[PDB]
């Protein structure tokens, strides 16, 4: 057989991301003397819309500590940050929407976004529009913090690792019916070419394992091992369960 | 229109060679040429740039 869609994605020819109109990589300030001991102000000068992100960006300027000049950082604008808000960053900063602090510096139940996985990565978790973590507990001895990611799974990460106070703006975005096929087009136009998708059951067996039949049908289990081989994995991969999910979710 | 020199030069060597035999060649001794074999024309054999 041929090479299926999902294998062909991976050397990334026409599949790589549509990078042109993009405001540049959103990140925190580097983790330096100013944030891990004192605190350091910045001003949000501009909040502005990123192409292929649902989440508005905040352009926040700081003062270079070690030479005379301004340095601009690209911040994921939590809901409520506004043009010309002062923003304070570091261990000893205060608790206000939009300031960033290490994690052992906030109470539990604190609602924070863009958190670092390890301190210094300039932000990892909950960068999506409307997406946040909650600090659920600290272990000061071997300083950690317990936090529930927007998936809901629970993780133990260094209290040093920073986060930004509040939830990301522009939430409720996926609350709206896309409503017609073109609207889908432009959304993925700026994102990548995954779209549209053609069912592997509507092709011939050389285009896909779901190919073939004098009726369209899968004809063998569409749950497929973790251990499958590339070009064996389409359908439900390594699913522990299948079928319509009844009753209530939400782990603990 | 606006052409590379490399092209506008080969164009010149082209035009320069598009000519009938020099008729005096025929008179030479043991001369086996008759006409110009390699003669080209714009509308017939294009040069391939």
């Amino acid at each position: 057989g041929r090479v299926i869609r999902n294998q062909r994605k991976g050397a990334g020819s026409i599949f790589t991301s549509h990078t042109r109109l993009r405001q540049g990589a959103a990140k925190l300030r580097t983790l330096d003397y100013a944030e891990r001991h004192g605190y350091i102000r910045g001003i949000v000068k501009q909040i502005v819309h990123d192409s292929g992100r649902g989440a508005p960006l905040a352009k926040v300027v700081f003062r270079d500590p070690y030479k005379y000049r301004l340095r601009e950082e690209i911040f994921i604008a939590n809901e409520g940050v506004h043009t010309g808000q002062f923003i304070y960053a570091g261990k000893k900063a205060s608790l206000n929407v939009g300031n960033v602090l290490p994690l052992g510096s906030v109470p539990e139940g604190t609602i924070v976004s863009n958190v670092e996985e390890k301190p210094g990565d300039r932000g990892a978790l909950a960068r999506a529009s409307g997406n946040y973590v909650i600090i659920i507990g600290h272990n000061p001895d071997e300083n950690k913090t317990r936090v529930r990611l927007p998936s809901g799974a629970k993780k133990v990460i260094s209290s040093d690792a920073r986060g930004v106070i509040g939830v990301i703006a522009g939430g409720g975005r996926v609350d709206k019916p896309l409503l017609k096929a073109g609207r889908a087009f432009h959304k993925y136009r700026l994102k990548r070419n995954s779209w549209p998708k053609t069912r592997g059951v509507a092709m011939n067996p050389v285009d896909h394992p779901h190919g073939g039949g004098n009726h369209q049908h899968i004809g063998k289990a569409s749950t497929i091992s973790r251990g499958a081989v590339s070009g064996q994995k389409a359908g439900l991969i390594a699913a522990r369960r299948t079928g319509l999910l009844r009753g209530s979710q939400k782990t603990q | 229109a606006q052409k590379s020199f490399r092209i506008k030069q080969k164009m010149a060597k082209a035009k320069k060679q598009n000519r009938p035999l020099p008729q005096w060649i025929r008179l030479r001794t043991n001369n086996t040429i008759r006409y110009n074999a390699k003669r080209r024309n714009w509308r017939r054999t294009k040069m391939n740039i």
Binding site: - | R6, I7, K10, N48, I49
Partner: protein, 84 residues
């Protein structure tokens, strides 16, 4: 018309003039030429291609330096000049 009406669209040279061998084999978008492999250091050749080989090997050119090297060898590689 997978034919004629859609040959009416061929205006764009796949290759231009190779610098090294002059062959109009120089692939534009690939910035290399399909005959001698310029710009590769060595000049492209293969053994299944003996007709290509025979086409381009030594002796289809001017042999500008090499010609006389059999003469020069004949003489013991002389320096100076003859007298009278």
């Amino acid at each position: 018309g997978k034919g004629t009406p859609s040959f009416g669209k061929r205006h764009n040279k796949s290759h231009t003039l190779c610098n090294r061998c002059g062959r109009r084999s120089f692939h534009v978008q690939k910035k290399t030429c399909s005959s001698c492999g310029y710009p590769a250091a060595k000049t492209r050749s293969y053994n299944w291609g003996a007709k290509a080989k025979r086409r381009h090997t030594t002796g289809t050119g001017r042999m500008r330096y090499l010609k006389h090297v059999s003469r020069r060898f004949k003489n013991g590689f002389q320096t100076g000049s003859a007298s009278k």
